[PDB]
RNA sequence: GGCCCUUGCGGUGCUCCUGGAGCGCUCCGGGUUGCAGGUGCCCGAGGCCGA
RNA sequence: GUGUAACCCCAUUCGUAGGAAUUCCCAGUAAGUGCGGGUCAUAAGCUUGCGUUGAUUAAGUCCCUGCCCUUUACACACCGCCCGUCGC
RNA sequence: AAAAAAAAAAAAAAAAAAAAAA
């Protein structure tokens, strides 16, 4: 298994380093196929190997894959299994933190959260690839508020990271009751560079492929590149009137670091991308928007 | 005495029974010996 | 006679009540047929493409369970709604082996990464027991009453354990005792290839008191077990047309350049049909299919005893 | 906005059932519809010269290439279809 | 990172025919100086020489 | 001729130990003191185990030398037990007749398996598997 | 470095008289002065070029 | 790819053998059938086991290789194999390995400062 | 050879008097060991702590009161002053006395409540060997504890004098006034 | 008792000797659970083969001649000077 | 343990019956040997390499 | 953890702690102890890694507090129809 | 390019010699 695991990563990095080639070269291959359907001018950069591109646009099918992309080979069963996520905090937690981490259980479905004792780094990644966990989740805590997110794909996928600002608990508010659970609806705003849809590709892929009529929203907002976690569930008193009810905890995020590697490979995996807090045009640039 | 990995005896590619086209390469290693005297074609 | 699977069948095995017979095939199903009316009733198939090695059914007849080749994960399905239950993972390694125990409904499968698991069914949380071992496992067999279980290891010794306390109860070595004979093409000598092979078949008596051992030699050993002593060793055949019989080859047939068995090797594969391909250890395909090893694929003891 | 389930290759027993039910719409009247369709499409396969001669070119050289692999393979899972049962005594199938 | 990435691939039951007469010490592949291997004749001659 | 000398290793968490076995009069010696110096002597009697269950004359014909690093005392302690078994048993396998060696292992694995087979704690959880039983859990 | 050699084993090194070491000191001064000057020259055909 | 592309018989035909070659390891990636022409008598010979023990760094001379499973020092899974023609499949390349009790492992483990005699030899 | 705790205390000799608890206390030849710390994992599944041997479950069971957790050896010298002190004071095996103690202080049938928020109503039910196995090990301990507590008195003597008054039957030993009341409860909700 | 494969002395049966006179005859039972030796003097023992501990004596009317053992079976021939056989 | 022109020491040159794979030999007998239809086989170099 | 150990152990002396309510927790888990780093965010009486010692009870029901679903693949065997209202 | 080892010299330098990156 272990081999398996060292021949599987060095057949994912391989594929990325062409990716662009293939890009490249795919999208040569339409401008000649676009140049017969319509009798016009082969391109001149095409006029060479024009009959080279030709066979391989006859060989093409759909039976074929298809160009590689690396998001897809990170997340392969995204929508064909249901996720199962992994829960658990920093060594000596505070009685908040655990307050925190028992929330986080309900508001993914199928979730479980364990207890944080001596267990090295290395082991739970190791322990978690062992008995098919897809995500991997570790919060941090600062003074009995929480402050940092780590949320890590097992299968060599990327590791993301975040801090977070406003956090308020259920445990905070009184009488509220128990959670309705069910799978929920995801909707996600904000999003539009390309920064911004891999991150909320992260944060969808957490969650279950919901039914229809079920009534639980969960909402990512972004706002100058501050994501909002709101967690609502609403019934339609009548046609065109709906009434919506908070439940849950209300939080803010902060991306800043993207790595390609698992949480137990700082040291060799490589940065997506990371946020420069000393550029000169540091104070008024946004990333996840456009 | 007993050997393995053992091969059927075939032609060689380096040999001279073939034209000089047919054949591989020379495999031969040149090295400039240091008592060796430097000669080189410059025209004033 | 049932041909619906394409591929070879590796694993077979009655219901303990019914009239009924379920096989693991190759071709990534588990099927199982009815003696009443003769037909294939169920069939399971995993969600993701892999290949069956074994199967194994529970006494009561509502579980079955299976193991990969690749997936390296137990597969268990319900006899009669037919989904799967669930999938079991944690071993490291293709699984040799899976048998019930036929009084207290857990199930033991062993591993190429020197570990025998066990899996409790009925059991409302999930309670698992791993069994380390020196050496790669390769099989796994219940006492009839299934309170001691004997685990085959390929440094060739027998282990027996007690499940319920996970503890050796006993140890047999028996490397010496499977006389194993040189092929014609192997360079190496008859001790050298002994050195590598374990026993890879192993089958309790209807009582217990006696064990079973069998691999790839014309020989079946009978131990018994609490003694871990040699009773007895069964010769299954003295066909001597049938390759890697003898232990010294015969000097008569040497001469200067080699025994030569390439000659005798296309005077056999002479018989056509088909065409000899390199690389096919077994079937029509294989060279080396006119005179096969002696190998004893399995053993199995009759319920009654008789 | 949500994760989009993809398609299967790989039919079950208790969706193929569903569909069978949900178009037509007296189980015997739902299973000889589909009967007649999976005849008409096998007698169309054997129509096409070319299709059946591609076929048996295929089965030849996949019957070779898993013995060079000792028979380890990627599986195809199984398709369900409907099969004609008589009612006559089990002694002929033995 | 160079270094500690080539670590991640290393295959244990990796073989060499420089592993058979060099023994690892503390992980440190130190290649031990060869040995003279005088012979007790020429052993008295470098003393008589030395005298 | 050549001495017979084997070396066997023994691990208990991050203690190692290694133990050599050649001929001898009956010496086992730990870093350099004898078995009754080691620290702590509360588990002294661990550190004795083997030897009561096997008796001097079997210790007579050879000596022992074990040096161990890393870990706590405990973990010590278990490794020294570990690697002096295991060297003894393999001793008797290379240089005397199989048929003691299959005695004494025996023995020793009928007492406590912890003295010849290392088993590492893993992490095992009714948290990695889900919510109810096997069978029985949604249908 | 293998620095260690026995006492029996260890042999009593060379006594050089004064006009050699007069011989052996000129060489290498001499050829450290030529060494410097031919790495000099080195440079200076590399920013040349 | 004579037959239409769009055709339900070329799609099913185009999977199954595109799955079969890559298990085998013949073609690089499951792509177009582009990649199918590039299959050529020396694509067999790089999955025989000899070869592939010189890409695991288990060997590096090709008659080292060629001599080591002759001699029985290799073995994939439980089985030790000794016939060079031995076609290794992707998933099976993961389990070769030196068998037990073989010299060539206990130089390897010598080396590496982890021999103890009490498991190699039992 | 004959395996005898700290090296001087026999288990030959020990024997049982209660048929019922024979399977639930690890005396005997196969579990005797030289000393109570063997690091094994008798809290990995349901039933198999009925295998730890009882002076290594009293040695745990005294760790956990009155004592900072994780603290074994000083637990493990606790329990050899306390049986050398109990070997001076009445002359036989401790072993015996240990056994006895644990026999004597086990109840037979508890009372299982039925409870609301106004009152709480009992049935007088059956225990199990298991549970009145652990039940007398926690009384002993948690008696020494309350004995030693703020007194001119070790932990080793009260947990000596626990054990001898447990074992002779004396109603002066906290967990046999703790049995008796528990049984009168339970005859008194039949 | 002595080893084969290394030739060293495994222990003997009896304090200081089995038999008072000459021993006709040993065996060993198939599963080496039983010992059994004959002596001139007409006695005939059977023993412990691990622990060596004496479990049973017969008495024999004429003093023992030859002796063999059908292992499987564990059937015992005796043959005695008066020239009868006993089994 | 035994050895007494010895050795914890080493080397050579011939002999040692082919399963199918040296068949055929008591006698008798061996002389007058008294145009259906065939189209085969061979021809691929690209490295998820190591040094 | 490369930028010019306590705890524990033996022996000596001395000598009679936090309500009502409420939160969290199932195995290298709870609890104690030491030793490092400051890593492009967060962090200074704080934050995160690493190791050492290492437990008691429990492996099951819907009784309370609730949550998620349902009440239209004909092997053998088993079983044999959920109910009500208002609209069209 | 660079971390080494073996010699001499001057009040560190100099010739050879291996490994590693490229
Ligand atoms: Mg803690
Ligand atoms: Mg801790
Ligand atoms: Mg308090
Ligand atoms: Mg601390």
């Not at chain 4, 295929?58 to 000792?70: G, H, V």
């Not at chain 9, 508890?110 to 009145?132: F, H, K, M």
């Not at chain 10, 024999?60 to 005796?78: A, E, K, T, V």
Request: proline share 4%.
């Amino acid at each position: 298994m272990l081999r398996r695991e060292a021949r599987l990563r060095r057949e994912y990095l391989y594929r990325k380093a062409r990716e662009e080639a293939q890009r490249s070269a795919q999208e040569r291959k339409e401008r000649l196929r676009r140049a017969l359907e319509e009798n016009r001018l082969i391109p001149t950069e095409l006029r060479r190997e024009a009959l080279a591109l030709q066979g391989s646009l006859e060989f093409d099918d759909a039976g074929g894959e298809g160009v590689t992309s690396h998001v897809d080979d990170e997340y392969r069963w995204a929508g064909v299994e249901d996720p199962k996520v992994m829960i658990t905090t920093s060594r000596d937690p505070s009685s908040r933190l655990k307050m925190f981490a028992k929330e986080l259980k309900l508001v993914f479905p199928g979730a479980q959260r364990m207890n944080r004792g001596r267990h090295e780094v290395g082991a739970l990644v190791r322990a978690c690839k062992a008995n098919g966990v897809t995500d991997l989740l570790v919060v941090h805590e600062h003074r009995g508020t929480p402050v940092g997110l780590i949320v890590s794909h097992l299968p060599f996928g990327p590791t993301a990271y975040f801090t977070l600002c406003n956090v308020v608990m259920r445990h905070d508010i009184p009488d509220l009751g128990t959670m309705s659970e069910a799978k929920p609806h995801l909707i996600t705003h904000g999003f539009s560079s390309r920064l911004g849809k891999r991150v909320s590709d992260i944060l969808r892929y957490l969650f279950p492929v919901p039914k229809d009529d079920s009534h639980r929203v969960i909402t990512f907002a972004n706002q100058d590149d501050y994501i909002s976690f709101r967690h609502h569930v609403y019934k339609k008193t009548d046609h065109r009137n709906v009434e919506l009810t908070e439940v849950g905890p209300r939080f803010e995020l902060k991306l800043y670091m993207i790595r390609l590697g698992t949480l137990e490979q700082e040291a060799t995996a490589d940065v997506e991308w990371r946020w420069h807090p000393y550029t000169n045009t540091a104070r008024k640039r946004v990333f996840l928007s456009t | 005495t007993r050997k393995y990995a053992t091969m059927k005896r075939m032609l060689s590619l380096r040999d001279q029974r073939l034209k000089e086209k047919d054949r591989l390469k020379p495999k031969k290693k040149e090295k400039k010996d240091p008592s060796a005297l430097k000669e080189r074609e410059v025209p004033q | 006679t049932f041909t619906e699977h394409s591929s070879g069948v590796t694993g077979v095995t009655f219901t303990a009540t019914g009239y009924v017979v379920v096989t693991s095939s190759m071709d990534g199903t588990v099927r199982a047929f009815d003696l009443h009316r003769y037909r294939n009733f169920r069939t399971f198939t995993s969600p993701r493409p892999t290949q069956f090695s074994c199967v194994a059914v529970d006494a009561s007849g509502e579980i079955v369970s299976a193991g990969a080749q690749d997936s390296f994960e137990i597969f268990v399905w319900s006899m009669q709604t037919g989904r799967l239950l669930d999938v079991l993972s944690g071993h490291e390694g293709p699984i040799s082996g899976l048998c019930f125990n036929p009084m207290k409904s857990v199930l033991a499968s062993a591993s190429w990464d020197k570990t025998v698991r066990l899996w409790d069914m009925f059991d409302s949380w999930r309670t698992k027991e791993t069994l380390a071992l020196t050496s790669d496992a390769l099989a796994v067999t219940f006492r009839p009453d299934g309170a001691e279980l004997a685990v085959a290891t390929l440094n060739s010794q027998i282990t027996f354990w007690d499940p319920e306390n996970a503890v050796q109860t006993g140890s047999i070595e028996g490397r010496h005792d499977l006389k194993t004979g040189r092929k014609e093409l192997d360079k190496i000598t008859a001790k050298h290839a002994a050195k590598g092979k374990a026993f890879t078949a192993l089958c309790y008596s209807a009582d217990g008191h006696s064990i079973l051992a069998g691999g790839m030699s014309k020989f079946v050993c009978i131990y018994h077990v609490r003694e871990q002593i040699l009773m007895k060793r069964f010769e299954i055949s003295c066909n001597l047309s049938l390759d890697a019989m003898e232990e010294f080859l015969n000097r008569r047939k040497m001469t200067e350049f080699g025994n030569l068995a390439l000659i005798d090797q296309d005077a056999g594969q002479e018989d056509g049909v088909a065409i000899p391909l390199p690389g096919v250890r077994k079937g029509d395909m294989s060279s080396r299919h006119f005179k096969p090893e002696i190998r004893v694929t399995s053993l199995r003891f009759s319920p009654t005893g008789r | 906005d949500d994760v989009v389930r993809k398609e299967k290759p790989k039919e079950d027993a208790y969706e193929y059932k569903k569909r069978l039910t949900l178009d037509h719409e007296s189980l015997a009247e739902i299973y000889e519809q589909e009967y007649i369709k999976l005849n008409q499409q096998k007698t169309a396969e054997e129509e096409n010269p070319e299709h059946v001669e591609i076929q048996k070119m295929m089965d030849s050289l996949f019957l070779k290439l898993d013995a060079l692999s000792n028979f380890h393979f990627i599986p195809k899972p199984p398709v369900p279809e409907i099969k004609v049962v008589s009612n006559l005594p089990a002694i002929t199938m033995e | 990172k160079a270094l500690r990435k080539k670590a991640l691939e290393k295959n244990p039951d990796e073989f060499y025919y420089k592993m058979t007469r060099v023994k690892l010490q503390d992980g440190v592949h130190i290649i031990k100086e060869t040995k003279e291997e005088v012979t007790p004749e020429q052993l008295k001659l470098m003393r008589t020489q030395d005298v | 001729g050549p001495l017979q000398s084997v070396q066997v290793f023994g691990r208990k968490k991050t203690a190692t130990a290694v133990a050599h076995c050649k001929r001898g009069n009956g010496l086992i010696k730990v870093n350099g003191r004898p078995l009754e110096m080691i620290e702590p002597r509360t588990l002294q009697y661990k550190l004795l185990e083997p030897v009561l269950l096997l008796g001097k004359e079997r210790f007579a014909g050879v000596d022992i030398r074990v040096r161990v690093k890393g870990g706590g005392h405990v973990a010590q302690i278990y490794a020294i037990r570990q690697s002096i078994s295991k060297a003894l048993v393999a001793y008797y396998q290379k240089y005397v007749d199989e048929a003691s060696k299959k005695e004494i292992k025996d023995i020793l694995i009928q007492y406590d398996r912890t003295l010849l087979v290392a088993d590492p704690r893993r992490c095992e959880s009714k948290k990695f598997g889900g919510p109810g039983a096997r069978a029985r859990y949604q249908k | 470095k293998a620095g260690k050699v026995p006492k029996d084993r260890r042999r009593p090194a060379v006594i050089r008289e004064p006009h050699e070491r007069k011989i052996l000191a000129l060489l290498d001064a001499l050829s450290t002065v030529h060494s410097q000057k031919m790495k000099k020259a080195k440079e200076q055909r590399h920013l040349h070029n | 790819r004579d037959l239409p592309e769009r055709d339900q018989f070329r799609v099913r035909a185009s999977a199954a053998l595109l799955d079969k070659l890559y298990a085998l390891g013949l073609v690089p990636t499951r792509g177009s059938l582009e990649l199918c022409d590039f299959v050529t008598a020396s694509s067999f010979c790089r999955r025989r086991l000899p070869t592939v023990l010189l890409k695991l760094r288990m060997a590096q001379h090709l008659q080292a290789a060629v001599a080591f499973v002759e001699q029985g020092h290799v073995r994939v899974g439980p089985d030790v194999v000794t016939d060079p023609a031995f076609l290794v499949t992707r998933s099976m390349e993961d389990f070769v390995t030196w068998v037990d009790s073989s010299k060539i492992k206990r130089h390897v483990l010598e080396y590496n400062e982890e021999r103890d005699d009490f498991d190699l030899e039992a | 050879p004959d395996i005898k705790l700290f090296g001087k205390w026999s288990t030959d000799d020990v024997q049982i008097n209660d048929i019922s608890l024979q399977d639930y206390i690890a005396v005997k030849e196969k579990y005797a060991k030289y000393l109570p710390h063997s690091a094994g994992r008798y809290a990995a599944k349901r039933f198999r702590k009925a295998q730890c041997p009882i002076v290594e479950r009293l040695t745990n069971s005294m760790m956990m009161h009155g004592r900072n957790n994780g603290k074994k050896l000083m637990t493990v010298r606790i329990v050899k002053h306390a049986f050398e002190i109990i070997h001076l004071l009445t002359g036989e095996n401790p072993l015996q006395v240990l056994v006895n103690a644990i026999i004597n202080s086990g109840p037979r049938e508890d009372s299982t409540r039925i409870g609301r928020a106004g009152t709480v109503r009992r049935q007088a039910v059956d225990v199990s060997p298991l549970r009145r196995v652990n039940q007398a090990i926690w009384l002993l301990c948690t008696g020494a504890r309350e004995a030693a507590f703020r007194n001119i008195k070790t932990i080793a003597e009260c947990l000596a004098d626990e054990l001898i008054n447990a074992a002779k039957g004396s109603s002066n030993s906290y967990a046999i006034k703790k049995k008796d009341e528990l049984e009168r409860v339970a005859k008194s909700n039949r | 008792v002595y080893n084969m494969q290394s030739g060293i002395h495994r222990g003997s049966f009896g304090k200081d000797q089995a038999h008072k006179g000459s021993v006709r005859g040993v065996a060993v039972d198939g599963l080496n659970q039983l010992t059994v030796t004959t002596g001139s003097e007409g006695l005939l023992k059977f023993w412990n083969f691990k622990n060596k501990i004496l479990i049973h004596s017969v008495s024999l009317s004429s003093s023992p001649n030859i002796m063999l053992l059908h292992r499987d079976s564990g059937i015992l021939g005796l043959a005695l000077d008066d020239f009868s056989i006993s089994v």
